[PDB]
C-alpha cells in the first residue's frame, strides 16, 4: 500500500483506482492505463498549476495525500481510515471514482466532517443529502443517463429489451432507474440478470447463454463496470453470439473494454459524459519519465506494463511516451474541475475568514468541514479551467451537489481498414439528438434495422389483434371472413349483402350474379324456344300470304310464349317481374280459349271472358308485391338471386285453374266427336304439365333448373299445339 | 445516552430501542418489545454469566450498549465510540436490521472487532470476503425463502405478489424468494411492490390499489419491517379489503403483537414464519420483577414505564405498578437468540482463556490486549447448549443451521403453530383456519375436453380456448383433427364412429317404386299366364310366340330390377345392379326395334330371323356389359355426404352403392339409342292400324319419361341429397316405361280375345 504524499500547508486526499481488482489471493493486481494513472496525473497537474497560480491561493501551498483504492470498497475504506487518522490533517479528498467506493468512503467521512468531491461516481443514491451531507460531485446522477438511453431505445423502436447489470451501488440503482423510466415509455424487459463482483468466466458464459434464452430480444443494456463489460464481451465472442449493446458510462469510449473483443462489439452504442480534451494535460503527460517523475510511486509499474520491459534488465529507456500515440481519458476534465472547485472553495474561505494576511491565518488552522462544505456548495461559480477555445462551461453545484445532465453518444465502428474506433453520433442535452447518418448500421442502404421486439406485428385488415391486457407481447388472431377490421382492437361487419374486401373498413361490395342466358342447363331450352318462335314466324308468314280469326289468334298466341321465354333467361327487373306473372297466365289461357272457339259475336265473347281473367290476374298480382327484390341467402356463401316472389303462391295456381277449365272445355269436343286432333293436344298438354310437377317437386333448391324447366314446358307446349293442330293442315296444302 | 457497565471485559451492544424517526428527527417512537425486551435479554444474560462459576471464573463482563434507533446512519456514529480509542470492547452484539449490521460489520471488521447478530437475516452478510468478522445465530434468508415457497406449494396456490421495503433485508428477501420460485417454475410473481423507507402521505394507501389491480393474486408475501406491516394493515382497512388478502409474513413478523395490535379483524389467518425458538422461563421472571427503583441501570427503562402502562411521571403514575398483571406481557421471540449471542461470545472467551491463561485465574498479561483475529476463530468453534436446550453452532461463514417453524394468526387472538421447516416442510393444514381452503391461482382450470390450454407470457395463467366440432383433444396442450370417417365424441377428447344412411323400404320416396313394382309384376304375370292358358292362333300370330314372351320377361326383369335397387346394399348385389338394368332395358328395346323393323319392311321364317337379330342385339349389349363388368368391380360406396362433411356433427351418415356416372349414362345411352331408332321408324309409319297405334303410344311414353330424367338426375347435384333421390327416380323411370309399353300392347290383345 504505497502512499503519494506531497508537502504543503494543507493537503488534499486522493482515491484513484490505480490498480484493478485481483483474484482471491491478491487485493489488487495490474495497473490500469487510463482510469488510474491518467486521472492521478491529471490531479497532480491541476495541483501543480494551482500552486503557481497567483489568482488562486498565492500565499498557501496545496499538498496531496493520494492513495490507491485498488478498485475495491474495503481497500478504499482502509485508505479512508488513513485519511481520518489525523482527525482521530485532511481538509478534503478528491476521489471516489467507483460509486460503491464513494459511498463506503463517504460513510466514514460523514462522522469526521471531511468534505468529499467525486469526479466519476454517478450513482443516483448519492444525491440523498440526509445520508451524504458532506459529499459533492461534478458529474450528474444516473437518472439523466437512464432517461437518455430510454429515449435512445424509443428512437429505434426498441421495446422488448434485455437488462444486464452489475451488483453493487452503481449497476443496481441504475437498473431500477432505467426500468422505471422505460415503463413510462412502453418498453418491455425480457430478462434481468445480475453480474457478481467475484464470478468466473464460466459464470459469464452462463449469463450470455441466459441472454440467448430469448431469441425475441436482440439488444441488451449494460450497467456493468469496465472489467465486467469486457468479460461479458469476451464470453459473447467465445460463444459466437452477435449482440448490439446500449451501455452506460461504465463502458463509454474505453478501448481496454474492446481489447481482444472487436468482433463482438460491432454496432454497440455506448454513451459517455460530455467532456473536452485538455491541451495542457496532453503535453504534461507526454513529458513524463520514470526517472524524472519520482513523485508517483506507481509510475514504474505503469512504465513496465505499458512499454513491455524490465527495470532490472535495463531495457526501458528506449521507449518514450511522445513517440507512441496518446489518448486522453474522458473524465480528466471532471478531475480537474473537482480539484479546482476545492481550491476555489479554500480561496473563498481564506478571503472571507483571513482578510488581512495572505498565508493561512491562525483562525483557520482547524479547517471546519461544515463551513467548507457550505462554502463550495454555494460559492463555486467560475469558468471551467482550460476551456478549448470559446466554450461557456462553468463549474456549478446544485442543492444536491450533482452536476449538469449533459451526455455524449458514441458507437463502435470498423473504419474500413482495421482501426476499430469510437465515433460520436449524437448527444443528450436534455433531449435526444441522434445522427443516424454516422451510424454504419442504420443507413437506408444497410438493410432492415436491428429489431428487438416481443410480439411480431401483423397486417390489421387480414389479421386482428387480441388485446391481452398487457403492455406488449400480444397475439395476432385473424377474424372470420365475414368480419371487417374496422378497428385494431376488434373487427366489425359490413352487414348482409356486403363483402368486406378492398379497403376492409368501408367495403360496399355486393355481387349480383344472375342465371344468365348461357347456362349449362339452360343451353337446351333457349335454342328450343328460338326454334319454336322461328316455326311460328313461318306459320304466321304463310297466313299473311293466304277460321281466319281463330288461326290468327292461335299463331299470335304461340308467339308471346316463346317471347317471354327470352325475357326470363336474360334478367329480372321491376317491370320484368310484373309482366312475367301476367304474361304467362294470359298466354296459356288465350291459347286454350282460342282452341275452344274452334270447337264451337263468338270471338267477342271469348275475348271478353279472357279480359276477365286479366282482372283476376291483376288482383292476385297486386297482393303479391310484383316489384323486384334481391333476396339474400340465409347464410353468406351465396349471393343475391333477384327473385321476384315465391313461386308456390296462388298466382300460378289461379292461371292453371282457368287453363284447366278451358282445357276441360275442349274435352267437351271429344264427347261431341279436327275433333280428334284437338283432343290429342289436350291429352298431350295434360301429360307434359303432369310431367312438370315431379320436376318442380324434387328441385326445391337449385332455382336455376326451376326456371330452365319452366322454359322447357312452355316451349314444347306451343310446338305441340302447332305440331298437331296446324301440321296436318299444312300437309294438305304444302305436302299435298 | 448509553448504558455503561464496568467489568474486566467489555462487550458491545446495539439494539433498536427507539423506532426510526420521521422527517428530520433521528429517533421516533420507543419500541417496547423489539428494543426493550431484547436489550434486557443482554442484561439478564450478562448478570447470569457473571454469576456462573463454571463460565469465566473471577472475570466480570462489562457492557456498552448503544441505541441503534433503527437507522443505519445513526448506528454508525454510535459505533464510533467502540473504535475511537483504538486510533475497549472486544466484540459487540450485532443489531437487528440487516442494513444496520452491514455498516457496523464493515467498520468493526476494519478494526478487527468480531460481531454476532441476534436478528440479522440476510444472504449478503453471509459472504466471507466482506464480512469475515461477522457472525450470526439465526438462519439466513436463503433458507427462509426456500421455506416460504414450500408453504406456497403445499397450500395449492401458485400466483402471488411480493411486498418489500427499502434495505438489504426486504429487497434481498423477495429477490431470494423470486430466485427460488424460478427454480420451482410453477410459482410466479404477478407484481412486486417496494415500500420506500421515507414514504410520503398516503403512500401505503396507493400500494393497496397496486395489489387490488390484480384481484387474482389474493395471497401476497410481505418482507417489510415491523413498522411498515402495521401501516400496510391499516391501509387495507381504509380500502375495506379485510379478508381479501392472504398475508405471508417473514421473520420480521413471526409472532410480534405490535403489527397486529388493534387490528385483530384484519389479517386473520395470516401465515407467518420464524426461526425455531422456545420461551425462556428465566427471562420472564427477571423482566416481570423490574420496577422504576431496582432497574436503574437501563436509562430507557424509565421511558418504558409510560409507554407500557399509558401514564406519565395524561393520568398520573403510581410507583407500585407491575408489568405482568397491570399490562399485557409477552417476551419477544428473538430474546432467546440474544441470550445465545451473548453466551457464544462468553463461551469463546472462556475457551480462549483456558489456553492463553492456563495458570492465571483471572486475566493473564498476554491476554489483556485481545486481538479480534484470535478471538474470531474461537467464536466459530463453540458447540455449547444454550437455554431451552437448543444447540448453537457457527459454520465457516459464521452462520446458523437452517431451522424454521410456521405460525398462523387465528381468532377464537394468538399465533398457533401449524408446521415446521427442517430442510423439508411439515405443514399441518388440518389445523390451519382462515372461506374454506382459499386459493389464489391465475386462469382457473377448464377441462370440458373441448377447451384447450393456451400458455400466456406467465406460465401460471393457462388461457382457455375451446376446440371446434371438427377436431379431437389428444391432449390438453393441443387438439388434433379426427379421421374423416370418424366423428368427434360428445366430449371433444377422442373421436367416435360416423353413422350411415342405407336405402330401405318405408322412406317417403322409396314407397312408390315398391308399390309400382308389385302392380307391374302382377300385371305382367297375369298377361303371360293368360296367353299360356288359352293360346288363340290369331293373337299369337301377331305376337310371334317368341318376341312377345321375351318382351314380357324383359319388362318383368325391370320390375325385378327395382326390387334389388332398394334391397340390402352388398358388394355382390351392388355390382349386379348394372346387369339387371342393362339386360332389362336392352331386351325391351331390342325386341321392340325388331318388331317395328319387320312391320316397316313388309309395309314397304320371318319371326325366326327377328329373334336372331334381337339375340344379336342382346349379345352386343352383353358384350358391352362384360366390358363394364370388369372395368371396375367396385364393392360399394360408403361416404356420400361424408366426403364433404358438414360443419356441425348432427348427422353425416350415408350409405351408397358402387356406381359410376359414365357407366349409368353409357348403359342408358345404349337403351336410348335403340329407342331413337324406334322414334324414326314410328314417325315414318305414322303416315297396320293394330300395330301403328300401340307402337306410337309406346315411343310417346318412353320419350316423355326419359325427357324428365335428365333435369332430375343432372339437377340433383349440390342438393340436400343425391343418392336417395337418384335411385328412386331411376326405378320409377324404367318401371313406367316398361308398364306403359307392356300395358299398351297386352290390353288390346286380352280385350280382343275377350269379345271373340
Ligand atoms: C420506427 O423507426 C422509424 C425510423 O427508423 C420511424 O420512422 C418510425 O416512426 C418508428 N415506428 C413507429 C411506430 O413510430
Ligand atoms: C528526463 O530524464 C531523462 C533521463 O532519463 C533526461 O535526459 C531528460 O532531460 C529528463 N527530462 C526533463 C528533465 O525534463
Ligand atoms: C457438536 O457436538 C455434537 C455432539 O458430539 C455433534 O453434533 C458435533 O460434535 C458438534 N456439532 C456441530 C454442528 O459441530
Ligand atoms: N461512473 C461509474 C463508473 C466510474 C468510472 O467511470 O470510472 C460509477 O458511478 O461508478
Ligand atoms: N430479520 C430481519 C428483522 C429482524 C427483527 O425483527 O429485528 C432483518 O434482518 O432485518
Cβ A512 under 6 angstroms from ligand 1 = no
Same domain, B125 and B58: yes
B240, three cell numbers: 375495506
Q: Length of chain B, please?
A: 756
List the CATH number of the domain containing A167.
3.40.50.2300
Residue whose CA is closest, atom 9 of ligand 3? B383
Q: Select from B489, B490, B462 the least CA-distant residue to B477.
A: B462
Cβ B42 under 6 angstroms from ligand 5 = no
B143, three cell numbers: 433458507
**Gap positions in chain B, given as the residue before each gap (C–N > 2.5 A)?**
87, 313, 412, 434, 604, 687
Counted domains in chain B? 5
- Asked if the Cβ–Cβ distance from A111 to B76 is below 8 Å, we say yes
> A-B interface: how many C-beta pairs under 8 angstroms?
65
Is B80 an interface residue toward A (CB < 8 Å)?
Answer: yes
Virtual CA dihedral for B362, B367, B369, B372, nearest 10 degrees?
Answer: -120
Cβ B98 under 6 angstroms from ligand 5 = yes
Count CA atoms closer than 13 A to A688's CA, side-chain side: 22
What gap in Å lies between CA A568 and CA A712, rounded to an integer? 12
Q: How far apart are the first and last CA of chain B?
A: 154
Q: CA angle at residue B374 from B370 to B380, to 5 degrees? A: 120
- Asked if the Cβ–Cβ distance from A88 to B84 is below 8 Å, we say yes
Same domain, B212 and B352: no
What gap in Å lies between CA A129 and CA A115, rounded to an integer? 13
E strand or H helix at B233, and its extent? helix B226-238
Show Cβ contacts of residue B610 under 8 Å, excluding neighbours closer than 6 positions: B544, B546, B547, B594, B595, B597, B598
Show Cβ contacts of residue A371 under 8 Å, excluding neighbours closer than 6 positions: A349
What gap in Å lies between CA A361 and CA B23, rounded to an integer? 39
- Answer whether residue B468 is part of any domain: yes
Closest ligand to B259 CA? 5
Q: Select from A101, A109, A100 the least CA-distant residue to A76.
A: A101
- Answer whether residue B440 is part of any domain: no
- Answer whether residue B286 is part of any domain: no
Task: Measure A157 CA to ligand 1 centroid, in angstroms.
Answer: 6
Which atom of ligand 3 has the smallest separation from the CA of B393?
13
- Answer whether residue B396 is part of any domain: no
Q: Is A76 annotated as a binding residue?
A: no
Q: Select from A166, A401, A73, A142 the least CA-distant residue to B103.
A: A73
- Asked if the Cβ–Cβ distance from B76 to A473 is below 8 Å, we say no
DSSP for B678-727, written as a single string: HHHHHHHHT--HHHHHHHHHHHHHHHHHHHTHHHHHHHTTTSS-SHHHHH
E strand or H helix at B271, and its extent? strand B271-275
Same domain, B641 and B659: yes
Q: Which among A139, A225, A272 is the best mutation to test ligand 4's pocket, defined by most ligand atoms within 8 Å of the CB?
A: A225
Q: Is B119 annotated as a binding residue?
A: yes
What gap in Å lies between CA A161 and CA A221, rounded to an integer? 8
DSSP for A323-362, written as a single string: TS-----TTHHHHHHHHHHHHHHHHHHHHHH--S-SS--G
- CB contact at 8 A, A342 and A376: yes
Side by side, the strands of the sheet bearing A116-118 are A3-6, A62-67, A10-15, A90-95, A116-118, A135-137
What gap in Å lies between CA A736 and CA B315, rounded to an integer? 149
Same domain, B351 and B362: yes
Same domain, B680 and B692: yes
- CB contact at 8 A, B166 and B195: yes
Domain that holds residue B162: 141-277+404-431
Task: Measure A289 CA to ligand 2 centroid, in angstroms.
Answer: 7
Q: Which residue in the set A85, A111, A473 is minimally distant from B457, CB to CB?
A: A473
Cβ A157 under 6 angstroms from ligand 1 = yes
Same domain, B149 and B82: no
Virtual CA dihedral for B50, B52, B55, B57, nearest 10 degrees?
Answer: 70
Same domain, B319 and B267: no
Judging contacts by C-beta atoms under 8 Å, the chain B residues touching residue A77 are 106, 110
The values of phi and psi at residue B495, to 5°, are -115, 180
- Answer whether residue B388 is part of any domain: no
Judging contacts by C-beta atoms under 8 Å, the chain A residues touching residue B720 are 700-701
Sign of the alpha-carbon torsion through A526, A532, A534, A537: negative
Collapse the DSSP code of A320 into the 3-class scheme (helix H, G, I; strand E, B; otherwise coil) and give the result.
coil
CA A486 to chain centre: 20
The values of phi and psi at residue B296, to 5°, are -105, -5
Same domain, B714 and B572: yes
Cβ A443 under 6 angstroms from ligand 1 = no
Show Cβ contacts of residue B247 under 8 Å, excluding neighbours closer than 6 positions: B219, B220, B222, B267, B270, B271, B272
Q: Which residue in the set A77, A88, A110 is minimally distant from B87, CB to CB?
A: A88
Same domain, B518 and B664: yes
B483, three cell numbers: 379421421
Q: Select from B287, B273, B275, B301 the least CA-distant residue to B331.
A: B287
Can you tell me which residue has the cell 488562486? A56
What gap in Å lies between CA B187 and CA B239, rounded to an integer? 27
Cβ A292 under 6 angstroms from ligand 2 = yes
Q: Is A35 annotated as a binding residue?
A: yes
- Asked if the Cβ–Cβ distance from A111 to B705 is below 8 Å, we say no
- Answer whether residue B233 is part of any domain: yes
What gap in Å lies between CA B724 and CA B511, rounded to an integer? 12
CA B232 to chain centre: 32
Residue whose CA is closest, atom 10 of ligand 3? B383
Same domain, B210 and B325: no
Domain that holds residue A197: 142-273
Same domain, B605 and B587: yes
A33, three cell numbers: 492505463
Is B505 an interface residue toward A (CB < 8 Å)?
Answer: no
Cβ A358 under 6 angstroms from ligand 1 = no
Q: CA angle at residue A110 from A106 to A116, to 5 degrees? A: 50
* DSSP, res A401: S
What gap in Å lies between CA B115 and CA B101, rounded to an integer? 9
Q: CA angle at residue B101 from B96 to B107, to 5 degrees? A: 150
Residue in chain A nearest B72 by alpha carbon: A131
B21, three cell numbers: 424517526
CB atoms within 10 A of CB A321: 15
Burial of A410 (0-12, 13-18, 19+ CB in 10 A): buried
Closest ligand to A283 CA? 2
Same domain, B313 and B342: no
What gap in Å lies between CA B184 and CA B149, rounded to an integer? 8
Judging contacts by C-beta atoms under 8 Å, the chain B residues touching residue A111 are 76-77, 80
What gap in Å lies between CA B657 and CA B277, rounded to an integer? 86
- Answer whether residue B285 is part of any domain: no
- Answer whether residue B728 is part of any domain: yes
Show Cβ contacts of residue A651 under 8 Å, excluding neighbours closer than 6 positions: A581, A585, A617, A620, A621, A624, A645
List the CATH number of the domain containing B472.
2.10.50.30
- Way the structure was solved: cryo-EM
Amino acid at each position: 500500500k504505497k502512499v503519494l504524499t506531497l508537502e504543503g500547508d494543507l493537503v488534499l486526499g486522493g482515491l484513484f483506482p490505480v490498480h484493478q481488482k485481483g483474484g482471491p489471493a491478491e487485493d489488487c493486481g495490474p495497473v490500469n492505463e487510463h482510469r488510474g494513472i491518467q486521472r492521478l496525473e491529471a490531479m497532480l497537474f491541476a495541483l501543480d498549476r494551482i500552486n503557481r497560480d497567483p489568482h488562486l491561493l498565492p500565499g498557501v501551498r496545496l499538498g496531496a495525500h493520494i492513495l490507491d483504492s485498488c478498485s475495491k470498497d474495503t481497500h478504499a475504506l482502509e485508505q479512508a481510515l488513513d485519511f481520518v487518522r489525523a482527525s482521530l490533517a485532511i481538509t478534503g479528498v478528491i476521489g471516489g471514482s467507483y460509486s460503491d467506493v464513494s459511498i463506503q468512503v463517504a460513510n466514514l467521512l460523514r462522522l469526521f466532517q471531511i468534505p468529499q468531491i467525486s469526479y466519476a461516481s454517478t450513482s443516483a443514491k448519492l444525491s440523498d443529502k440526509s445520508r451524504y451531507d458532506y459529499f459533492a460531485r461534478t458529474v450528474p446522477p444516473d437518472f439523466f443517463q437512464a432517461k437518455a438511453m430510454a429515449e435512445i431505445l424509443r428512437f429505434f423502436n426498441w421495446t422488448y429489451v434485455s437488462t444486464v447489470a452489475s451488483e453493487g451501488d452503481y449497476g443496481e440503482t441504475g437498473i431500477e432507474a432505467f426500468e422505471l423510466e422505460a415503463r413510462a415509455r412502453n418498453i418491455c424487459v425480457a430478462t434481468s440478470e445480475k453480474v457478481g463482483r467475484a464470478m468466473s468466466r464460466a459464470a459469464f458464459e452462463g449469463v450470455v447463454r441466459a441472454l440467448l434464452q430469448k431469441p425475441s430480444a436482440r439488444v441488451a443494456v449494460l450497467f456493468t463496470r469496465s472489467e465486467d463489460a469486457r468479460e461479458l464481451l469476451a464470453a459473447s465472442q467465445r460463444l459466437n453470439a452477435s449482440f448490439t449493446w446500449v451501455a452506460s458510462d461504465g463502458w463509454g469510449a474505453l478501448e481496454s473494454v474492446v481489447a481482444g473483443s472487436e468482433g463482438a462489439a460491432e454496432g454497440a452504442i455506448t454513451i459517455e459524459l460530455a467532456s473536452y480534451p485538455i491541451s495542457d494535460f496532453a503535453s504534461y503527460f507526454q513529458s513524463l519519465d520514470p526517472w524524472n517523475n519520482s513523485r508517483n510511486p506507481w509510475f514504474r509499474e505503469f512504465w513496465e506494463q505499458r512499454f513491455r520491459c524490465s527495470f532490472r534488465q535495463r531495457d526501458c529507456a528506449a521507449h518514450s511516451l511522445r513517440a507512441v500515440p496518446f489518448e486522453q481519458e474522458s473524465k480528466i476534465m471532471f478531475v480537474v474541475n473537482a480539484v479546482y472547485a476545492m481550491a476555489h472553495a479554500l480561496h473563498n474561505m481564506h478571503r472571507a475568514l483571513c482578510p488581512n494576511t495572505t498565508r493561512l491565518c491562525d483562525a483557520m488552522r482547524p479547517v471546519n468541514g461544515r463551513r467548507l462544505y457550505k462554502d463550495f456548495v454555494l460559492n463555486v461559480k467560475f469558468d471551467a479551467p482550460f476551456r478549448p477555445a470559446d466554450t461557456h462551461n462553468e463549474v456549478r453545484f446544485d442543492r444536491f451537489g450533482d452536476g449538469i445532465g449533459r451526455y455524449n453518444i458514441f458507437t463502435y465502428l470498423r473504419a474500413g481498414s482495421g482501426r476499430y474506433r469510437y465515433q460520436k453520433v449524437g448527444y443528450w442535452a436534455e433531449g435526444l439528438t441522434l445522427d443516424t447518418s454516422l451510424i454504419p448500421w442504420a443507413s437506408p442502404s444497410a438493410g432492415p434495422l436491428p429489431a428487438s421486439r416481443c410480439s411480431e406485428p401483423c397486417l390489421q385488415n387480414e389479421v386482428k389483434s387480441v388485446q391481452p391486457g398487457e403492455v406488449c407481447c400480444w397475439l395476432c388472431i385473424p377474424c372470420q371472413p365475414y368480419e371487417y377490421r374496422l378497428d385494431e382492437f376488434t373487427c366489425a361487419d359490413c352487414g348482409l349483402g356486403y363483402w368486406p374486401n378492398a379497403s376492409l373498413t368501408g367495403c360496399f361490395e355486393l355481387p349480383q350474379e344472375y342465371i344468365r342466358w348461357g347456362d349449362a342447363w339452360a343451353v337446351g331450352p333457349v335454342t328450343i324456344a328460338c326454334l319454336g318462335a322461328l316455326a311460328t314466324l313461318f306459320v304466321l308468314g304463310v297466313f299473311v300470304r293466304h277460321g281466319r280469326e281463330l288461326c290468327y289468334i292461335l299463331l299470335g298466341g304461340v308467339f308471346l310464349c316463346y317471347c317471354m321465354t327470352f325475357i326470363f333467361i336474360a334478367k329480372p327487373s321491376t317491370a320484368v317481374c310484373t309482366l312475367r306473372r301476367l304474361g304467362l297466365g294470359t298466354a296459356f289461357s288465350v291459347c286454350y280459349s282460342a282452341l275452344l272457339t274452334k270447337t264451337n259475336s263468338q270471338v267477342a265473347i271469348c275475348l271478353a271472358l279472357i279480359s276477365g281473367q286479366l282482372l283476376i290476374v291483376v288482383a292476385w298480382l297486386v297482393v303479391e308485391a310484383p316489384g323486384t327484390g334481391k333476396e339474400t341467402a340465409p347464410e353468406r356463401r351465396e349471393v343475391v338471386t333477384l327473385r321476384c316472389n315465391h313461386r308456390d303462391a296462388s298466382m300460378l295456381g289461379s292461371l292453371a285453374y282457368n287453363v284447366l277449365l278451358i282445357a276441360l272445355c275442349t274435352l267437351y269436343a271429344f264427347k261431341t266427336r279436327e275433333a280428334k286432333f284437338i283432343g290429342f293436344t289436350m291429352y298431350t298438354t295434360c301429360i307434359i304439365w303432369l310431367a312438370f310437377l315431379p320436376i318442380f317437386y324434387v328441385t326445391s333448391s337449385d332455382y336455376r333448373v326451376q326456371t330452365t324447366t319452366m322454359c322447357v314446358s312452355v316451349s314444347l307446349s306451343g310446338s305441340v299445339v302447332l305440331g298437331c293442330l296446324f301440321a296436318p293442315k299444312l300437309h294438305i296444302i304444302l305436302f299435298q | 445516552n448509553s448504558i455503561r457497565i464496568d467489568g474486566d471485559i467489555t462487550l458491545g451492544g446495539l439494539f433498536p430501542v427507539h423506532g426510526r424517526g420521521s422527517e428530520g428527527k433521528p429517533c421516533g417512537e420507543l419500541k417496547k418489545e423489539k428494543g426493550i425486551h431484547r436489550l434486557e435479554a443482554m442484561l439478564f444474560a450478562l448478570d447470569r454469566i457473571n454469576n456462573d462459576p463454571d463460565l469465566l471464573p473471577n472475570i466480570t463482563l462489562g457492557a456498552r450498549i448503544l441505541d441503534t434507533c433503527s437507522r443505519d446512519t445513526h448506528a454508525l456514529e454510535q459505533s464510533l465510540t467502540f473504535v475511537q480509542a483504538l486510533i475497549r470492547v472486544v466484540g459487540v452484539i450485532g443489531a437487528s436490521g440487516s442494513s444496520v449490521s452491514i455498516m457496523v460489520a464493515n467498520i468493526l471488521r476494519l478494526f478487527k472487532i468480531p460481531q454476532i447478530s441476534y436478528a440479522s437475516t440476510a444472504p449478503d452478510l453471509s459472504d466471507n470476503s466482506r464480512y469475515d468478522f461477522f457472525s450470526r445465530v439465526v438462519p439466513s434468508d436463503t433458507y427462509q425463502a426456500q421455506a416460504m415457497v414450500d408453504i406456497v406449494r403445499a397450500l395449492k396456490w401458485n400466483y402471488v405478489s411480493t411486498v418489500a421495503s427499502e434495505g438489504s433485508y426486504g429487497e434481498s428477501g423477495v429477490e431470494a424468494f423470486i430466485q427460488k420460485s424460478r427454480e420451482d417454475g410453477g410459482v410466479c410473481i404477478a407484481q412486486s411492490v417496494k415500500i420506500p423507507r421515507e414514504p410520503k402521505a398516503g403512500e401505503f394507501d396507493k400500494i393497496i390499489r397496486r395489489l387490488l389491480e390484480t384481484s387474482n393474486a389474493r395471497a401476497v408475501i410481505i418482507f417489510a419491517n415491523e413498522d411498515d406491516i402495521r401501516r400496510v394493515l391499516e391501509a387495507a382497512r381504509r380500502a375495506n379489503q379485510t379478508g381479501h388478502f392472504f398475508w405471508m409474513g417473514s421473520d420480521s413478523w413471526g409472532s410480534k403483537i405490535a403489527p397486529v395490535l388493534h387490528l385483530e379483524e384484519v389479517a386473520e389467518g395470516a401465515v407467518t414464519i420464524l426461526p425455531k425458538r422456545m420461551s425462556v422461563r428465566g427471562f420472564d421472571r427477571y423482566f416481570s420483577s423490574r420496577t422504576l427503583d431496582n432497574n436503574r441501570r437501563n436509562i430507557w427503562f424509565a421511558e418504558f414505564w409510560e409507554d407500557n402502562f399509558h401514564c406519565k411521571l395524561v393520568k398520573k403514575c403510581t410507583n407500585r405498578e407491575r408489568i405482568g398483571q397491570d399490562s399485557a406481557y409477552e417476551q419477544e421471540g428473538k430474546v432467546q437468540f440474544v441470550i445465545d449471542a451473548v453466551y457464544a461470545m462468553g463461551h469463546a472467551l472462556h475457551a480462549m482463556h483456558r489456553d492463553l491463561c492456563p495458570g492465571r485465574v483471572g486475566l493473564c498479561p498476554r491476554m489483556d490486549p485481545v486481538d479480534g483475529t484470535q478471538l474470531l476463530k474461537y467464536i466459530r468453534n463453540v458447540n455449547f447448549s444454550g437455554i431451552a436446550g437448543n444447540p448453537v453452532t457457527f459454520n465457516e461463514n459464521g452462520d446458523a443451521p437452517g431451522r424454521y417453524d410456521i405460525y398462523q394468526y387465528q381468532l377464537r387472538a394468538e399465533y398457533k403453530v401449524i408446521g415446521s421447516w427442517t430442510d423439508h416442510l411439515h405443514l399441518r393444514i388440518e389445523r390451519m383456519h382462515w372461506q374454506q381452503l382459499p386459493r389464489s391461482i391465475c386462469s382457473l382450470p377448464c377441462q370440458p375436453g373441448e377447451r384447450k390450454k393456451t400458455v400466456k407470457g406467465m406460465p401460471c395463467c393457462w388461457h382457455c380456448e375451446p376446440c371446434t366440432g371438427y377436431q379431437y383433444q389428444v391432449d390438453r396442450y393441443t387438439c388434433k383433427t379426427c379421421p374423416y370417417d370418424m366423428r368427434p365424441t360428445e366430449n371433444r377428447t377422442g373421436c367416435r364412429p360416423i353413422p350411415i344412411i342405407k336405402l330401405e323400404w318405408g322412406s317417403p320416396w322409396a314407397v312408390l317404386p315398391l308399390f309400382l313394382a308389385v302392380v307391374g309384376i302382377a300385371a305382367t304375370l297375369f298377361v303371360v299366364i293368360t296367353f299360356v292358358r288359352y293360346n288363340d292362333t290369331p293373337i299369337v300370330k301377331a305376337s310371334g310366340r317368341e318376341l312377345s314372351y321375351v318382351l314380357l320377361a324383359g319388362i318383368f326383369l325391370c320390375y325385378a330390377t327395382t326390387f334389388l335397387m332398394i334391397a340390402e346394399p352388398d358388394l355382390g348385389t351392388c355390382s349386379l345392379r348394372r346387369i339387371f338394368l342393362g339386360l332389362g332395358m336392352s331386351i325391351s328395346y331390342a325386341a321392340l326395334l325388331t318388331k317395328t323393323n319387320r312391320i316397316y319392311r313388309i309395309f314397304e321364317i320371318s319371326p325366326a330371323s327377328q329373334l336372331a337379330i334381337t339375340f344379336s342385339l342382346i349379345s352386343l349389349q352383353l358384350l358391352g356389359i362384360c366390358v363394364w363388368f370388369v372395368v371396375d368391380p367396385s364393392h360399394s360406396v360408403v361416404d356420400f355426404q361424408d366426403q364433404r362433411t358438414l360443419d356441425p356433427r348432427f348427422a353425416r351418415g350415408v350409405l351408397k352403392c358402387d356406381i359410376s356416372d359414365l357407366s349409368l349414362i353409357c348403359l342408358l345411352g345404349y337403351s336410348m339409342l335403340l329407342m331413337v331408332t324406334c322414334t324414326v321408324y314410328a314417325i315414318k309409319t305414322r303416315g297396320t292400324f293394330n300395330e301403328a297405334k300401340p307402337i306410337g303410344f309406346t315411343m310417346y311414353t318412353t320419350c316423355i319419361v326419359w325427357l324428365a330424367f335428365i333435369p332430375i338426375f343432372f339437377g340433383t347435384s349440390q342438393s340436400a341429397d343425391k343418392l336417395y333421390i337418384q335411385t328412386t327416380t331411376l326405378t320409377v323411370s324404367v318401371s313406367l316405361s316398361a308398364s306403359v309399353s307392356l300395358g299398351m300392347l297386352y290390353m288390346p290383345k286380352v280385350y280382343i280375345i275377350l269379345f271373340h
